[PDB]
Symmetry: C4
Subunit: 332 residues, 4 copies
């Protein structure tokens, strides 16, 4: 594979149609899904030349750990839908690549099993029925060695995925929520923050004042995100809010972004707009569906090469230098 798009076509061949649709789809008319790509494609980088590139490194420090790339695997529920080894295959490849892996509340393998793979994983939280049960998941994750709590804050309930409705899609018998909901509020965030010493990362922030409030609330990071266009149809892409949010936060927390990152060049664009790091969702599942653990390994090796390539061509010996790049909006 020489691009991430090679993997999508590979995954479309192997996966049952309704499972491919569950993976690919968005809510409503899929306007926000498409806009995630359109918005990235409008961004152009202004590269710098003639800088010292003797020691180009793509590494970052985030949430107390060195990562090999400014990237983590996004939370994607029920990964056994895509391959029999599910989350274990993905976590093993992420570990080997030096990339953080986000364990889901709705993982199809238990969080303790996935954490035992190693690789200093993160844990994504869905707010439950009950403050007490929510906090027990958090404590489980922490006890198992997870290093950050990625609190999903854009799912008071799940969006209307019309492909799934039309397909009559439901979980197969053989896929379960192996770790086993009410709308989260700022009170929920405070309950989590008080219950753990781990950094709390709020995933799904788009409004500038919600980013500011996240810092005020003691968040260690946010993910600027419209949930891959799967939640509010018509929600602005995260990439379009990122610059404004980075300015408003003024270094008070890590600012990640996701939605449609499909190459090292896209990672460079996100960094140039001010992101600390990106999450990548669907492409990791394409790789998993296509070729299991080895597929995810190949994807991460490709992304690593593309990120190094893009950084050097843009005159950046470090991710910090890439954040100081300027950009220009074009038309496509």
């Amino acid at each position: 594979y020489v691009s991430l798009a090679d993997l999508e076509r590979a995954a479309r061949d192997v996966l049952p149609g309704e499972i491919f649709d569950f993976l690919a789809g968005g809510s409503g008319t899929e306007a926000s899904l498409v806009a995630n790509r359109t918005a990235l494609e409008r961004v152009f980088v202004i590269p710098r030349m003639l800088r010292d590139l003797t020691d180009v490194t793509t590494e970052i420090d985030i949430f107390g750990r060195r990562a090999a790339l400014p990237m983590a695997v996004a939370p994607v529920a029920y990964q056994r839908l895509f391959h029999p080894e599910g989350e274990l295959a993905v976590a093993r490849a992420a570990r080997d690549a030096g990339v953080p892996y986000t364990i889901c509340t709705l993982s199809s393998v238990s969080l303790e099993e996935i954490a035992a793979v190693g690789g200093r994983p993160w844990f994504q939280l869905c707010w439950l029925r009950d403050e007490k049960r929510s906090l027990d998941l958090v404590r489980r994750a922490e006890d198992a060695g997870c290093e950050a709590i990625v609190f999903t804050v854009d799912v008071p309930w799940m969006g209307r995925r019309l492909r799934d409705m039309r397909n009559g899609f439901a979980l197969p018998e053989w896929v379960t929520a192996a770790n086993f909901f009410a709308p989260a509020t700022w009170e929920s965030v405070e309950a989590v923050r008080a219950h753990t010493d781990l950094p709390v990362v709020l995933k799904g922030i788009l409004a500038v004042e919600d980013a500011r409030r996240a810092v005020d609330a003691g968040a260690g990071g946010i993910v600027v995100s419209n949930h891959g266009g799967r939640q509010l149809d018509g929600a602005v892409p995260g990439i379009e809010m990122l610059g404004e949010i980075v300015a408003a936060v003024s270094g008070g927390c890590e600012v990640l972004v996701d939605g449609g990152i499909r190459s090292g060049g896209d990672v460079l664009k996100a960094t140039a707009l001010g992101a600390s790091a990106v999450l990548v969702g669907r492409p990791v599942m394409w790789a998993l569906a296509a070729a299991g653990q080895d597929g995810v390994r190949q994807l991460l090796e490709l992304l690593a090469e593309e990120v190094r390539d893009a950084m050097g061509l843009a005159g950046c010996e470090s991710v910090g230098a890439a954040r100081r790049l300027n950009t220009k909006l074009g038309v496509v």
Copy 2:
């Protein structure tokens, strides 16, 4: 049906071509018809997270009545063109859904019959030949229990609908104006205002100074509208003037908008731009053509679900909160 677009395809199958064209078409090159959709698609919402959604309500108070949604059925003449029960089917479904229904001057069932359905209806006025006859329609409507007069102000005469011309379209023998024209002016508006205690709503305002003058003239509301692209071809979409008009009116009257509203997400966009409520026209007729009263019921139930979904995903427990959402223009 899981989207409004499902209903358009259903209606295209059942309706005679020339009747579908009468319904779907615009004036001239249909530039303003298409622009109504293009303009909505360019609007993106910036949703808020982590707000209290224990008691989400889509209700509003408007013109002295509670409505179940920030939506009314737009005036559409001659509804027996689309189904034998015509206006009665639509008014019954609107009543049952808690949605105001606008009775037309050119209704194919008499306004008194439609009003007897109940549901606290509105009445749309075409200015007639004669101040005295115009005012008699208004008095009839008021006597029959209509709760607002929706004065159409963008039809000094009807626009040039080229589909209708090419089709040689005319009313069938079996469809008549059951309630049985000169250009309206500001004098006409004053005559109506002096003749009724009902709120007068001016439908078809696009210029900011006409919105201001509407308030000065004693209007209780306006509908920011290019008449679904059926009047001046090249008229700006209402959705593109809405923000400016809401600012200029500064709460002096209700500001509604119509043109291309095709989902709860579109309703959210209109509200975020400052609308009090929307009108929906063609989709209600698609539902009527497809399945009569039950079709319109299903459409309104779908819209209700989509509006609740969109509001909650955007962190809005009330329509007032949705009006305080910010937006960002994108490219499509």
Copy 3:
């Protein structure tokens, strides 16, 4: 015919391909040809409502004559290419419609014959070899009763029309320049101005300072124009410069525009941007090719109806009112 586009299709059937290409084509990649349409389509009118329309008139006074519409027939050379009656057919229809007709220097019927048709015609000048011969054409035109000199100022030489090159197109034996070149300069303009009491109109102005200089030079009007995309490929559309030019001239001369005017709605857009009047070129030749004099009559009757329709729907009882309309740029 119910639109101008009906006539283009009619003309494509009857005309030899290479003659249709001579008519339709532009220079280079035809970027400026296409941009004339794209630019008009981006303009939206903000119509006014509820104004007195008891005496709507589309008439204007220009260059000392009343015209029935804010429109004249553009200069198009060699009209016998399109119909055997050529310029006589077009001039007769223009006369009957009350529309000025521009007689070309390269007319295929002599200017005296065309002037004898009546209808108070204009005369378009190509600068010749020789100040003396150029001025003799001007004097001929004036002696024959022409009422304005339309000096073409954007043709120091003719543009590169690649359709014509590829077709190997040349004038048929049966078409000649019946009135029988060097680049014009500001000196040429002064020579013409000193030689006639007729208003001199400079056709092909796009730069704001050239519009200002035209007024300083004693021009009675200008046509803001890129010559229908037939001269510099990449020249900005006139419609995109019109507002700026109207502001700069501040009433010092008439400001006309041409390029892609294809409906009464387009005329309204041009007027709302500040034009005194428009020229229409290719559509008049479509009508001529399709049905001779009667074709041109039908075209002008259609345009008259569309202009009246658009003005009234926009609340304008006069062309002066239409010039005070505001506009908004959209996306298409």
Copy 4:
């Protein structure tokens, strides 16, 4: 041939697919390749009228030599890929046309042989392994009569060309680097500047501060360029940075641009945005592939005619006048 596009189609027929792909392709998704064209197409010229065109000249003085056009042949490696006479054919045609030719470090004919053709050539430098060897190439070029050193500064390494990867493309046995790499830095530039009295031209500048630093570093010129979209995928087109860079440099060095120049009209656009001259790459190779030396001659004759045509139609008797033209961005 009547356009440059005629030559691309001619070249596609004759060349092996993988060689055509090597020539045509870009890096990554080819976003920057496409954007070079999209950006030029958005630029419109505001032409001037009625100026003296008695002595229109397309000549410029640059780097101490008169050139017949504001254009040079871009450096393109390995020209024997496209025709057996390779660089000699192109250099002979450039000489005969009065156009500078850029001899490549990776030329498939030795730089001394190509220089012996005459025509006062330029030499493009790839920074080598070794300051000493790099400087020896420079001295060779200077000794052979090259008149400028075009230091490529946007290739710390080569970009990822996916067409080449997918094709498994490599140099044929019969093509070699007849003159026979480390990332260049500002230190490398200074080493070159100190080693030659020839003007040093930095090719591949996009950031305004890199243009400023180039002047500070003693560069005689820069080429504002994203390397034809072959290096960083997502790099802004040079044409989009050109105006800002010309303002920042304030006459301190020559500012050239390349990327997608495909007509004399495009040359005019570049000049109107402030360029001293353009480079043309792929079209010269199309002409070479299509018809060898005579093909390149025909291409340069066509470009000369198109540049003269465009300048005169825009009222410019000299390239300096063309630089004073204004432009307007449109939509396409």
